[PDB]
Structure 1
Amino acid sequence: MKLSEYGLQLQEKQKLRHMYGVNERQFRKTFEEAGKMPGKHGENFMILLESRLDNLVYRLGLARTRRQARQLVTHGHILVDGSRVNIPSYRVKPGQTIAVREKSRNLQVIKEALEANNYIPDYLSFDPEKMEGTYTRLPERSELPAEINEALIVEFYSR
């Protein structure tokens, strides 16, 4: 009942869930769905989250914030590998790219986020000319939030 480490664990899970705003259904599911690769389930969880269609959009600088990258997806405006994906929970993987939709290119919210280029990761190749964000490699932890953890969340399911 008094302060204890058991709480700090479920805590790291909350703040993280509020980080990119991953719904619980996406948080728990994405987890058991990451237990597939033998690369430490923890890391795998921090990897799938990045695949978040919205994150990628807000990362390549196609939107100023999640409220901008979220509406862009749902409003069907991103062509993954050349395919519209109005699904925010879907997930992308190397061998495909994110390409804004033609009728959705002069969007001020985008033409406005292109300038807000807050540095683009090294595994993401962005071509402003065609507005194509290619996933050329997987994301490492060196870039993903460092003030975040996942072990305390690993055993959480063991409870």
Structure 2
Amino acid sequence: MKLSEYGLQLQEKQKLRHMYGVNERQFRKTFEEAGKMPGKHGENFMILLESRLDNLVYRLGLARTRRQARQLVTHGHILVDGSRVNIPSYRVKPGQTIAVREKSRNLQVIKEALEANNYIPDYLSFDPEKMEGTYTRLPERSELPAEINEALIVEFYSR
């Protein structure tokens, strides 16, 4: 009857998993992949989940939801650092700029998400005139879901 902690640990993973829509492969992969940058492995995982090409797009205001942002990337409309990145699993890093493709600017789905913008993180600079977002810095926990805890998920790979 009383669920032990072993169940609460994976439970947390279930949430952070169906959160921004992180597939399992991208979850385990993005994981052993985050252990590359130094700075609390957990933090890294919480930093890549947002770096997701789709996340950043939706985070700014070019799409209303992942169904809208994800579709934008695939449409090779987002120009990273001035380069078409129709790859959603790709990853962006400081110094790179997210910019909507010209022909892909009258997109109603975007013109509609531009208004839905009313809260852009501090490390993301959104340019409305040229519709260009810039990764001016890395994200922090003061903005990522706080009701989440990767620890119980950290030792999970040590099992």
Which TM-score bucket, shorter chain as reference? over 0.9
RMSD over equivalenced CA pairs, Å: 1.0
Q: Deviations over 1:88-144 (max 9, x none)?
A: 110100011100001100000000000001310000001011111100000001000
Cα deviation for residue 75 of structure 1 reads 1.3
1:1-159 equivalences in 2 (<5 Å)? 3-159=3-159
Q: 2:130, 2:38 → 1: CA distance? A: 36
Q: 1:118, 1:71 → 2: CA distance? A: 22
Q: 1:100, 1:29 → 2: CA distance? A: 28
Q: Deviations over 1:49-90 (max 9, x none)?
A: 110000100011000001000110111110000000111110
Cα deviation for residue 2 of structure 1 reads 5.6
Q: 1:145, 1:71 → 2: CA distance? A: 24
Unaligned runs of 5+ in 2: none
Q: TM-score normalised to the size of structure 2? A: 0.97
3-state SS of paired residue (1:3):
coil
3-state SS of paired residue (1:99):
strand
Q: Percent identity?
A: 100
Runs of at least 4 residues off by over 2 Å? none
Q: 2:155, 2:52 → 1: CA distance? A: 24
Q: 1:144, 1:115 → 2: CA distance? A: 22
Unaligned runs of 5+ in 1: none
Q: 1:3, 1:48 → 2: CA distance? A: 31
Q: TM-score normalised to the size of structure 1? A: 0.97
Q: 1:135, 1:31 → 2: CA distance? A: 22
Q: 2:45, 2:124 → 1: CA distance? A: 19
Q: Deviations over 1:13-38 (max 9, x none)?
A: 01111000011111101111111122
